[PDB]
Design a binder for these strands. Structure first.
Length: 674
DNA sequence: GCCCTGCTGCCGACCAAC
DNA sequence: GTTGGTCGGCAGCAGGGCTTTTT
C-alpha cells in the first residue's frame, strides 16, 4: 500500500488515492498515473477518521461518478465503489427521510419533477397565466426559475424589479416564478436546486442536521469545480468551512478542475469560482501543475496553444514528456453525408479487424445532418449504429406515456395523460382536466371527484353526484389508485395489467400503437422483477426481491425503481460503432480515440453561440474541454455542406481549428483513402 | 410530414318525469 | 307503459404550424 507513493506529477495524485496536503488543482494534464493516481485522495479523505456520514462528493448526473468508479476499480482495484461518491441527493434524502417534514411542511416523501414533467411545465406555464406557448419562452422561463432557486430568492424582488430592475423581463420571470412557487407549495415538488435549498434551510434552522452536514463533511471530494453554482458553493462551504470548531479554516480540502472550462453556463455553470472559493476557503492551496506522462506532445502543443489562444482562459501552461504523436487529423468534405461515408470507411479499414467494435468512438453534433449521415453510412457498412440523443426521439410519444404510468403508480397526480383524450363536446373536452383538477371540491358542487367521471353506459349510480364539469373525465386512473391503495406491488401491477385490462388494452386492442405498449409494460414487469443479466442492483434489483431485502425505507426502493434512464453494455475495447450522441449526455465522459465529423466554423462553435457572445466564450471553452479530455489520440473532420431542416448552412474549417497550429490540426495521417 | 390538438362527434345510457 | 335531453367515451379531422440548441 505504501510502495507506490512517489515518482511523477501531482495531477492524478490529487485525483485518485493516497497522500496528504491540501488541494486546489489548476488543471494541467491529468495523465501520469503510476504512483500518481495512487498518491493523494483516499488518504486525504480518511486523514481525520472521516467516514461515509462525514464524506460527500459532487455529481449532477452520476456518469462522472461511474467513470471514477471504473478508473479506481481498474487502476486501483475497488476503493471508490464502497466509498461515498454518489450525489448530494443520496445523503440529502437519507437524512430528509427523517427531518424533511420539519421544514416547509415537505414530507419525507417529497415529490420530484422531471424532464418530461419539465416540458409539460413549460407548456402549462405558457398556457396557464396570461401567456402563450412562446411569448415568453417557457424553456428560458424555467431556466431562470432554476437560476432563482439556486440564488434562493423570492419572486417578490424581481416582481418589484418593474421600473426598479426591469420593466417586463425580470418582472415576467418573477411572475412565472411566483406561479411555479405556488404550484410547488400546492404540490411539494422539488428538484436539484430545491433539494440544495432545503438542505441549506435544514442546516440553518435545524440544529443536528447542521452539525451533521456542516461539520461531519469536513472532507469532501470536488471534481471540475468550475460548474459549481453559488448555491452549490454555499452548501460545500457549509460542509467544509463550517467545521465542528468554527474560527478555524475549512476542513481538509479536495477540490480539482479548471475554472475557465465554463461550457455549461447556458446549462447553469458558474464562470470563475476560484477567487470565490478562496475567501470562504482560506485553506485554498493552489497547485500549479504542468507535467504529463502518458498523453502525447502533440496534445501538449495543442493545449499550450489553446491555453493562451482563448482569451477567457486562465493560462495554465502544461508540459508533456511523451513524444509528439497523434496530430489531430481532420478531413475536409464537401458534404456531411460524404464526410460520414469517408469517416466510417476509414474506421472500418482501421479498426473492425480485431479491435474497437461497438461503443465508444462517437461524434457529438448539433447540426443533425451528421445524424442521418453517420447512421446511414454505418448501416451501409453493415456494422450496427448507436444513437443516444440523435434524431426522431422528441415528436415520438408513448415514452412520455410509459413514464406517466410509472409515475401514476408512484403518484396519481397526473392529469395531462387524461387531457390527451377528450370525452364530451364542450362538456368533458379540454375542460374536465383543466378546471376540476384544481377543485375536486367545488368545481360544480363535486361530491366525489370520480362520481360523474364514469361512462354513462357502464355507469356507477352509487357515485354520480357531481364530478369534472358535472359530466365526464374518462375514469381511467381512479380504479388504479384504489387498487394501489389496497394490495401489494406484485398483484397490484398484475391487476393493473389484466384485471383493469390496461395492458390488455395494449395487447388485445391493436388499432392505436398498442402492441408496442404491451411490450413496454412486459419490460416494466421484467424491471420490477429480476431481468437484468450478470448485474444485480444492491441486494434487491426489483422492488420485490425480498431474498435479502435492505433499507426498508421507501426512499431507496423508490429511487432505484424510478431512476431508469439509459444504459450501455458493449465494453470499452469495442468502440468501433460511431455513437451518435449530444454534448448534454457526455457532460462527464471521455474516450481514447475519436473521429469528429464536421468540426467547422458555425456548428461546434454553437449556432446559438454564432451570435451569442457569452455562449461564444462558453463554446470556445467547450472546444477547450473536448480537446483536453482526450488521452492519446483525438481526431476531427470537416463537412462544408450541412443541409438543416429549415435551410442549409455551410462552414469552412473552424476558427477553433486554425487557432491551433495547422500541423497540429492535421487532416492527412489517419484519414487517408480507406 | 407529420403533428399537437382542441373541435367534431355521434352514438349511448341518464333519468326522471310523463 | 313511455321517451327525449344530457350526462359520457375513445376516436376522426382539419388546420395552421416548425432551429440546431434548448439546464
Amino acid at each position: 500500500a505504501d510502495q507506490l507513493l512517489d515518482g511523477l506529477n501531482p495531477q492524478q495524485r490529487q485525483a485518485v488515492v493516497h497522500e496528504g496536503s491540501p488541494l486546489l488543482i489548476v488543471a494541467g494534464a491529468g495523465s501520469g498515473k503510476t504512483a500518481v493516481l495512487t498518491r493523494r485522495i483516499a488518504y486525504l479523505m480518511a486523514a481525520r477518521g472521516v467516514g461515509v456520514g462525514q464524506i460527500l462528493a459532487i455529481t449532477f448526473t452520476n456518469k462522472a461518478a461511474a467513470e471514477m468508479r471504473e478508473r479506481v476499480v481498474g487502476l486501483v482495484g475497488e476503493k471508490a465503489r464502497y466509498m461515498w461518491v454518489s450525489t448530494f441527493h443520496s445523503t440529502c434524502v437519507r437524512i430528509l427521510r427523517n427531518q424533511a417534514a420539519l421544514i416547509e411542511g415537505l414530507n419525507s416523501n417529497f415529490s420530484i419533477y422531471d424532464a418530461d414533467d419539465s416540458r409539460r411545465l413549460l407548456q402549462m406555464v405558457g398556457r396557464d397565466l396570461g401567456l402563450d406557448i412562446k411569448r415568453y419562452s417557457p424553456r428560458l422561463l424555467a431556466n431562470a426559475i432554476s437560476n432563482l432557486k439556486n440564488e434562493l430568492i423570492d419572486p417578490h424582488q424581481a416582481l418589484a424589479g418593474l421600473t426598479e430592475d426591469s420593466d417586463d423581463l425580470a418582472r415576467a420571470v418573477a411572475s412565472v416564478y411566483d406561479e411555479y412557487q405556488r404550484r410547488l407549495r400546492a404540490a411539494n415538488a422539488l428538484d436539484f436546486d430545491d433539494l440544495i435549498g432545503e438542505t441549506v434551510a435544514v442546516l440553518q434552522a435545524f440544529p443536528q442536521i447542521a452539525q451533521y452536514y456542516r461539520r461531519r463533511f469536513r472532507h469532501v471530494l470536488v471534481d471540475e469545480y468550475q460548474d459549481t453554482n453559488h448555491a452549490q458553493y454555499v452548501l460545500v462551504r457549509e460542509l467544509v468551512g463550517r467545521d465542528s470548531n468554527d474560527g478555524i479554516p475549512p476542513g481538509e480540502l479536495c477540490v480539482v478542475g479548471d475554472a475557465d472550462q465554463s461550457i455549461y453556463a447556458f446549462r447553469g455553470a458558474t464562470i470563475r469560482n476560484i477567487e470565490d472559493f478562496e475567501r470562504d476557503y482560506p485553506d485554498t492551496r493552489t497547485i500549479l501543475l504542468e507535467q504529463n506522462y502518458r498523453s502525447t506532445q502533440n496534445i501538449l502543443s495543442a493545449a499550450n496553444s489553446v491555453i493562451a489562444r482563448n482569451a477567457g482562459r486562465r493560462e495554465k501552461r502544461l508540459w508533456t514528456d511523451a513524444g509528439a504523436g497523434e496530430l489531430i487529423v481532420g478531413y475536409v468534405a464537401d458534404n456531411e453525408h460524404d464526410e460520414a461515408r469517408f469517416v466510417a470507411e476509414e474506421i472500418d479499414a482501421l479498426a473492425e479487424g480485431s479491435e474497437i467494435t461497438y461503443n465508444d468512438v462517437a461524434v457529438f453534433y448539433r447540426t443533425n445532418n451528421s445524424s442521418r449521415s453517420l447512421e446511414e453510412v454505418l448501416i451501409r457498412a453493415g456494422i450496427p449504429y448507436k444513437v443516444v440523443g440523435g434524431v426522431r426521439f422528441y415528436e415520438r410519444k408513448e415514452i412520455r406515456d410509459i413514464v406517466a404510468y410509472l409515475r401514476v403508480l408512484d403518484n396519481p397526480g397526473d392529469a395531462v395523460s387524461l387531457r390527451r383524450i377528450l370525452n364530451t363536446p364542450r362538456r368533458g373536452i379540454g375542460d374536465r382536466a383543466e378546471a376540476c383538477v384544481a377543485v375536486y371540491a367545488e368545481n360544480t358542487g363535486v361530491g366525489f371527484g370520480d362520481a360523474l367521471v364514469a361512462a354513462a353506459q357502464g355507469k356507477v349510480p352509487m357515485l354520480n353526484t357531481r364530478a369534472e364539469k358535472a359530466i365526464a373525465g374518462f375514469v381511467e386512473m381512479f380504479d388504479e389508485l384504489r387498487g394501489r391503495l389496497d394490495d401489494d406491488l406484485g398483484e397490484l401491477v398484475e391487476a393493473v395489467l389484466e384485471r383493469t385490462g390496461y395492458r390488455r388494452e395494449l395487447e388485445a386492442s391493436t388499432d392505436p400503437q398498442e402492441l408496442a405498449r404491451l411490450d413496454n409494460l412486459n419490460e416494466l414487469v421484467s424491471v420490477a422483477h429480476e431481468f437484468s443479466t450478470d448485474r444485480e442492483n444492491a441486494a434487491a434489483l426489483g422492488p420485490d426481491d425480498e431474498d435479502v431485502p435492505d433499507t426498508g425505507v421507501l426512499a431507496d426502493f423508490l429511487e432505484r425503481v424510478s431512476l431508469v434512464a439509459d444504459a450501455d453494455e458493449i465494453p470499452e475495447h469495442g468502440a468501433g460503432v460511431v455513437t451518435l450522441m449530444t454534448l448534454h449526455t457526455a457532460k462527464g465522459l471521455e474516450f481514447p480515440v475519436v473521429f469528429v465529423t464536421g468540426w467547422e466554423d458555425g456548428m461546434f462553435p454553437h449556432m446559438r453561440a454564432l451570435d451569442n457572445p457569452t455562449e461564444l466564450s462558453e463554446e470556445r471553452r467547450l472546444a477547450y474541454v473536448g480537446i483536453t479530455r482526450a488521452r492519446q489520440r483525438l481526431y476531427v473532420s470537416r463537412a462544408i455542406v450541412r443541409s438543416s431542416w429549415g435551410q442549409p448552412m455551410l462552414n469552412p474549417e473552424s476558427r477553433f481549428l486554425r487557432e491551433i497550429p495547422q500541423e497540429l490540426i492535421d487532416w492527412r495521417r489517419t484519414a487517408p483513402k480507406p
